[PDB]
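Suppose you are handed only these lines of text.
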Amino acid sequence: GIVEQCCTSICSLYQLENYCN
Amino acid sequence: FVNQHLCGSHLVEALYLVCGERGFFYTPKA
Ligand SMILES: [Zn+2]
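From them, the structure of the protein bound to zinc ion can be written out as follows.
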């Protein structure tokens, strides 16, 4: 998911915003 | 903003900056 994807590939801050509460 | 390559604790730092006081969930694969 997000953890893996940011490390194996690349991710954007907008993607990370999906993890905020 | 730019695309980032974030591993380990560096991802948790990014989440902290993005979410701030909303807080977040850090859910890695098992
Ligand atoms: Zn490091």
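What can we learn from it? Residues 12 and 26 of chain B are 7 Å apart (CA to CA). Residues B 10 surround zinc ion (CB under 6 Å).
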